[PDB]
Amino acid sequence: DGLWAALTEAAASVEKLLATLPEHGARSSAERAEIAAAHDAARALRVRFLDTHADAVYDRLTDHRRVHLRLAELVEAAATAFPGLVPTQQQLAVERSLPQAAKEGHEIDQGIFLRAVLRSPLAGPHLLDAMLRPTPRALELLPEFVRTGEVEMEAVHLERRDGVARLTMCRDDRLNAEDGQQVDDMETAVDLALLDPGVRVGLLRGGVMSHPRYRGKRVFSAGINLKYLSQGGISLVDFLMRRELGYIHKLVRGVLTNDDRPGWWHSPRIEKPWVAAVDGFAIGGGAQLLLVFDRVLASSDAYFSLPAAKEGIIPGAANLRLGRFAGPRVSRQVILEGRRIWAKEPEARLLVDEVVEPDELDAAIERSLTRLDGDAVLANRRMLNLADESPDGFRAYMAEFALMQALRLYGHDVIDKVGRF
Amino acid sequence: PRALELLPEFVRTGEVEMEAVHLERRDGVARLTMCRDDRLNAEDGQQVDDMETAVDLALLDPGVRVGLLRGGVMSHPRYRGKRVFSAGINLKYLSQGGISLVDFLMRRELGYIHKLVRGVLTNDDRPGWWHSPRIEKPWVAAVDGF
Ligand SMILES: CC(C)(COP(=O)(O)OP(=O)(O)OC[C@H]1O[C@@H](n2cnc3c(N)ncnc32)[C@H](O)[C@@H]1OP(=O)(O)O)[C@@H](O)C(=O)NCCC(=O)NCCNC(=O)Cc1cc(O)cc(O)c1
């Protein structure tokens, strides 16, 4: 062994250099290379330690796979139980108060950690189940939602109507640009939709925009908030990983419930079909969402892009899912070269089921919702999703993604590009 | 007659600013920009007169080889900073009685639009008129917005 002691020392060297060296941006090139080498030695040992000890580390935190912990709770418990393995809440607060260009990149350690956890065939599936459980916030709001049929959240408006959970993304000043709060609202709303027995089908649509160039027009998504990303407010764990393992995965697989109802022995998760309706455009994170719906409609003037081909972060699980929809040539055109796909071109039918003129779209959305009601759709979409995306495939991708995306979140090309927005 | 009047200054200057159209000779191209920035280039009697005048100038100017029709940058708030080709006839003026059967609807078809196809019929005043009594040139259209 000896890896823990080596890691502890290498982390100490890093903290000693951060204490003595000048602040980021005031460092000379020799000072910059010295701290960079210390970060590298420490992170190298984080990997080597977890290569052999990940399962034991995870077992301590979750009582040998007997307590389900979500991502935030997991990395926070790992910080206190294994100092130096991942950053503390206090170290993260310091990072979070800095712009991305000035951060030391302590989230990378969380990427290292979550990679090793998701790579384990024992710990990985367990963490994924934990993220499929209902959020506490949703369980809290569920009784009022059952009664009222309505919840107004900061980034999402949810309404039960005619057996449909109508999620409207309503950040009318910024084209529904995504942030940590949008993810929390989306997961809460998705949780409510799935837990509400009066909901049979879900609908995701963008609301009416108010920014002057789009006033009176609906817009689906302009993707991640690039301003916040530049400013330090995009969290690796609480945004980039949370959305993939939480609400987006619940759209596919449903919510894992307790053994508290009949039939749980054949359906431990409650899943329902989802419809997406795209107004204006779906960009980045919003386009990623479309790879997970049972039905996708778009207005005739809409387009779909994952535009950050030169200097962007990985487009979530698009790299996992797009090849299945579009094949390897088109997926590389979209992701490697930033090809934008328009709702009216033939290849839009790889991503969209129905393209409709603006004046006929509302009615076409309503028709689509009535077609997905039965028990037959539920069984069939479960079998399809199982065939389309294996547990191992999703897990193995999200394991590498945790580290690869962490690195991209701190890449100089990304920081530079995002600052110019 | 308006075009013949403006032709010498256009040959000299390479530029004419009209109410509904901006015309510029550049690199042998007659660049017609439809520039009613407040109403998405909605058409009226004056637009037709400007269009025909510009088309006439493009065809008569020996320094022009190819014509280009494009919409200019709009200033209306829903389209500010964006080019728009044409929103068609001015429906407000049509309601108000200001769309002329002869001077708009017939004039545009028999004048500038037909000159885009067939050119301008000139006098017998140049070599070759016996085989080409009309001067025609090729035209490019670039459609922004709609
Ligand atoms: C979409 C546009 C072409 C629209 O062009 P215009 O019609 O000229 O609109 P704008 O006036 O820019 O937009 C209106 C308004 O919203 C603001 N806006 C628009 N999009 C954004 C984003 N993405 N962030 C922040 N603010 C935004 C814009 O600044 C204006 O607000 P003011 O500054 O207050 O004037 C343009 O706004 C644009 O390029 N937006 C950014 C698109 C983009 O590159 N998004 C990021 C793509 N990358 C991801 O999503 C990455 C990602 C997301 C994920 O969810 C997960 C993951 O793993 C990775």
Side-chain angles (χ1 to χ4, degrees):
Chain A
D1 26 39
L3 292 172
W4 181 251
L7 170 56
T8 296
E9 185 183 4
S13 301
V14 168
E15 298 301 309
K16 265 160 182 195
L17 278 168
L18 295 187
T20 73
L21 262 40
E23 273 159 48
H24 205 285
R27 298 173 184 159
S28 67
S29 169
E31 293 173 324
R32 279 182 274 120
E34 189 178 9
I35 184 57
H39 279 319
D40 210 75
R43 287 166 189 166
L45 283 161
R46 289 181 180 109
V47 172
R48 292 180 59 198
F49 171 72
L50 288 171
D51 273 344
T52 48
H53 291 94
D55 280 313
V57 166
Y58 191 72
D59 287 350
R60 185 162 323 163
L61 303 173
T62 62
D63 192 14
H64 284 71
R65 277 154 297 112
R66 285 168 198 276
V67 184
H68 282 315
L69 298 175
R70 294 177 51 88
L71 292 163
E73 287 85 348
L74 187 72
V75 304
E76 182 180 70
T80 39
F82 300 84
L85 187 61
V86 295
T88 61
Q89 196 184 19
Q90 287 79 8
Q91 293 168 294
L92 290 162
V94 178
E95 289 282 84
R96 180 67 155 74
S97 65
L98 297 168
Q100 205 78 354
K103 290 183 188 194
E104 295 305 322
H106 291 322
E107 287 182 308
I108 297 179
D109 304 338
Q110 304 177 317
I112 292 169
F113 172 70
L114 294 173
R115 174 178 177 278
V117 172
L118 291 160
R119 278 172 70 78
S120 156
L122 288 169
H126 183 268
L127 175 60
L128 292 181
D129 278 345
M131 293 303 292
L132 293 176
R133 295 189 61 215
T135 54
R137 183 178 174 203
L139 294 168
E140 191 177 70
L141 306 171
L142 176 63
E144 269 296 282
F145 179 65
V146 173
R147 188 179 75 77
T148 277
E150 192 180 344
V151 197
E152 253 160 24
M153 297 177 249
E154 196 174 346
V156 174
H157 172 251
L158 169 62
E159 179 196 1
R160 169 184 55 263
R161 192 162 95 212
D162 303 322
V164 178
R166 316 191 131 244
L167 283 65
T168 299
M169 294 177 293
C170 61
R171 287 262 205 192
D172 43 56
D173 60 324
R174 64 187 83 167
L175 308 188
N176 284 313
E178 312 170 299
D179 57 37
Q181 189 58 60
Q182 187 261 7
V183 171
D184 187 70
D185 295 347
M186 286 293 289
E187 186 169 6
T188 303
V190 168
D191 281 339
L192 292 171
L194 295 172
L195 297 168
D196 184 357
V199 166
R200 293 182 292 279
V201 185
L203 172 74
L204 179 64
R205 191 166 186 193
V208 174
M209 290 298 109
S210 74
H211 192 273
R213 299 187 160 161
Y214 293 88
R215 200 185 296 272
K217 295 284 171 81
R218 293 177 179 271
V219 172
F220 189 79
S221 184
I224 209 168
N225 194 311
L226 298 164
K227 289 169 184 184
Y228 293 3
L229 179 50
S230 196
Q231 293 164 19
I234 291 304
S235 172
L236 173 70
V237 175
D238 297 350
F239 183 90
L240 296 172
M241 295 292 305
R242 184 187 173 177
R243 76 191 288 280
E244 303 301 335
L245 308 191
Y247 86 82
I248 298 171
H249 203 205
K250 290 167 176 177
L251 295 177
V252 177
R253 280 183 75 61
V255 280
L256 179 59
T257 75
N258 292 331
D259 190 347
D260 59 13
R261 54 189 167 80
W264 187 92
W265 53 271
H266 60 76
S267 301
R269 289 172 311 277
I270 302 172
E271 63 183 295
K272 293 172 188 180
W274 290 81
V275 181
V278 179
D279 306 279
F281 39 75
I283 299 175
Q288 304 172 12
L289 295 181
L290 302 186
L291 310 180
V292 133
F293 282 75
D294 308 81
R295 191 82 177 180
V296 182
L297 304 90
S299 59
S300 284
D301 64 328
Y303 63 84
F304 325 96
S305 70
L306 283 348
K310 310 195 208 197
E311 295 145 308
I313 61 173
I314 296 158
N319 309 53
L320 174 62
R321 301 187 172 123
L322 188 59
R324 180 202 307 165
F325 287 77
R329 283 274 71 78
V330 175
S331 69
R332 282 163 180 75
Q333 290 161 23
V334 173
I335 292 174
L336 300 191
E337 315 231 346
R339 184 186 158 197
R340 158 157 76 167
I341 292 169
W342 293 86
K344 291 300 292 192
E345 68 178 285
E347 287 180 337
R349 289 306 296 281
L350 300 170
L351 304 172
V352 175
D353 295 296
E354 251 190 292
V355 183
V356 192
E357 290 294 320
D359 275 350
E360 328 182 30
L361 178 59
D362 290 345
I365 295 171
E366 302 306 319
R367 272 189 294 278
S368 281
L369 296 166
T370 72
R371 289 192 307 257
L372 291 168
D373 263 335
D375 277 2
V377 171
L378 287 180
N380 280 323
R381 82 164 238 124
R382 180 169 174 182
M383 298 307 296
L384 280 159
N385 287 336
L386 179 159
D388 285 353
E389 198 175 276
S390 71
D392 281 1
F394 179 71
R395 194 185 87 240
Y397 177 100
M398 290 306 303
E400 297 315 298
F401 175 86
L403 180 52
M404 293 297 297
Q405 190 69 312
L407 298 165
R408 299 298 298 126
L409 186 64
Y410 289 95
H412 290 169
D413 65 324
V414 169
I415 293 165
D416 174 62
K417 167 240 180 286
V418 169
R420 300 185 294 246
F421 183 72
Chain B
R2 184 177 175 203
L4 294 169
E5 190 178 70
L6 305 172
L7 176 64
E9 270 298 285
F10 179 64
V11 173
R12 188 179 74 77
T13 275
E15 191 179 344
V16 197
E17 253 161 24
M18 297 177 249
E19 196 174 346
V21 173
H22 171 64
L23 169 63
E24 178 196 1
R25 169 182 57 262
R26 192 162 95 212
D27 304 322
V29 177
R31 320 186 127 251
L32 284 64
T33 297
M34 295 177 294
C35 61
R36 288 260 205 194
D37 43 67
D38 60 325
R39 63 187 83 169
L40 309 187
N41 284 312
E43 312 170 299
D44 56 37
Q46 189 57 59
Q47 186 261 7
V48 172
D49 187 69
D50 296 348
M51 286 292 288
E52 186 171 7
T53 303
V55 166
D56 283 339
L57 291 172
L59 294 172
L60 298 167
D61 185 356
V64 165
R65 293 182 292 279
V66 184
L68 171 73
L69 179 64
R70 192 166 187 193
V73 174
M74 291 297 109
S75 71
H76 192 274
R78 314 186 167 177
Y79 293 87
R80 207 193 307 282
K82 299 192 194 79
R83 293 178 178 272
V84 171
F85 190 80
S86 183
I89 209 168
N90 195 314
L91 299 163
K92 289 169 183 184
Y93 292 3
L94 179 50
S95 195
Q96 293 163 18
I99 291 303
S100 171
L101 173 70
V102 175
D103 299 351
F104 183 91
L105 296 171
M106 296 292 306
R107 183 187 173 177
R108 77 192 290 279
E109 303 300 335
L110 308 191
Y112 87 83
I113 298 171
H114 205 205
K115 289 168 175 178
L116 295 178
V117 176
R118 281 182 76 62
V120 279
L121 179 58
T122 75
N123 292 331
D124 188 349
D125 59 13
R126 49 189 170 82
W129 187 92
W130 53 272
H131 59 74
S132 302
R134 289 172 311 277
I135 302 173
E136 62 183 295
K137 294 170 189 180
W139 290 82
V140 181
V143 179
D144 303 277
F146 40 77

PDB file of all heavy atoms in Angstrom, chain A residues 212-213, chain B residues 77 80:
ATOM      1  N   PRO A 212     -36.099  41.504 -25.727  1.00  0.00           N
ATOM      2  CA  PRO A 212     -36.680  42.242 -26.867  1.00  0.00           C
ATOM      3  C   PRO A 212     -36.564  41.548 -28.217  1.00  0.00           C
ATOM      4  O   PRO A 212     -37.489  41.672 -29.033  1.00  0.00           O
ATOM      5  CB  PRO A 212     -35.902  43.565 -26.855  1.00  0.00           C
ATOM      6  CG  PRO A 212     -35.383  43.720 -25.451  1.00  0.00           C
ATOM      7  CD  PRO A 212     -35.228  42.338 -24.881  1.00  0.00           C
ATOM      8  N   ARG A 213     -35.484  40.811 -28.496  1.00  0.00           N
ATOM      9  CA  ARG A 213     -35.413  40.158 -29.805  1.00  0.00           C
ATOM     10  C   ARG A 213     -36.329  38.952 -29.917  1.00  0.00           C
ATOM     11  O   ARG A 213     -36.562  38.473 -31.034  1.00  0.00           O
ATOM     12  CB  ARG A 213     -33.974  39.802 -30.188  1.00  0.00           C
ATOM     13  CG  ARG A 213     -33.109  41.060 -30.274  1.00  0.00           C
ATOM     14  CD  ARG A 213     -31.702  40.830 -30.823  1.00  0.00           C
ATOM     15  NE  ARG A 213     -31.116  42.075 -31.315  1.00  0.00           N
ATOM     16  CZ  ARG A 213     -29.816  42.269 -31.511  1.00  0.00           C
ATOM     17  NH1 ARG A 213     -28.965  41.255 -31.423  1.00  0.00           N
ATOM     18  NH2 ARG A 213     -29.381  43.456 -31.910  1.00  0.00           N
TER      19      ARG A 213
ATOM     20  N   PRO B  77     -37.769  47.060 -34.182  1.00  0.00           N
ATOM     21  CA  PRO B  77     -37.254  46.313 -33.016  1.00  0.00           C
ATOM     22  C   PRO B  77     -37.296  44.795 -33.150  1.00  0.00           C
ATOM     23  O   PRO B  77     -36.405  44.119 -32.618  1.00  0.00           O
ATOM     24  CB  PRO B  77     -38.155  46.795 -31.869  1.00  0.00           C
ATOM     25  CG  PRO B  77     -38.703  48.125 -32.311  1.00  0.00           C
ATOM     26  CD  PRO B  77     -38.734  48.112 -33.810  1.00  0.00           C
ATOM     27  N   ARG B  80     -34.136  44.238 -35.526  1.00  0.00           N
ATOM     28  CA  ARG B  80     -33.038  45.198 -35.507  1.00  0.00           C
ATOM     29  C   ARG B  80     -31.698  44.488 -35.647  1.00  0.00           C
ATOM     30  O   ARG B  80     -31.393  43.539 -34.914  1.00  0.00           O
ATOM     31  CB  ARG B  80     -33.043  46.046 -34.235  1.00  0.00           C
ATOM     32  CG  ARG B  80     -32.381  47.417 -34.464  1.00  0.00           C
ATOM     33  CD  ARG B  80     -32.060  48.198 -33.195  1.00  0.00           C
ATOM     34  NE  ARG B  80     -33.206  48.354 -32.292  1.00  0.00           N
ATOM     35  CZ  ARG B  80     -34.194  49.229 -32.461  1.00  0.00           C
ATOM     36  NH1 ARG B  80     -34.208  50.028 -33.516  1.00  0.00           N
ATOM     37  NH2 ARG B  80     -35.173  49.299 -31.572  1.00  0.00           N
TER      38      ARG B  80
END
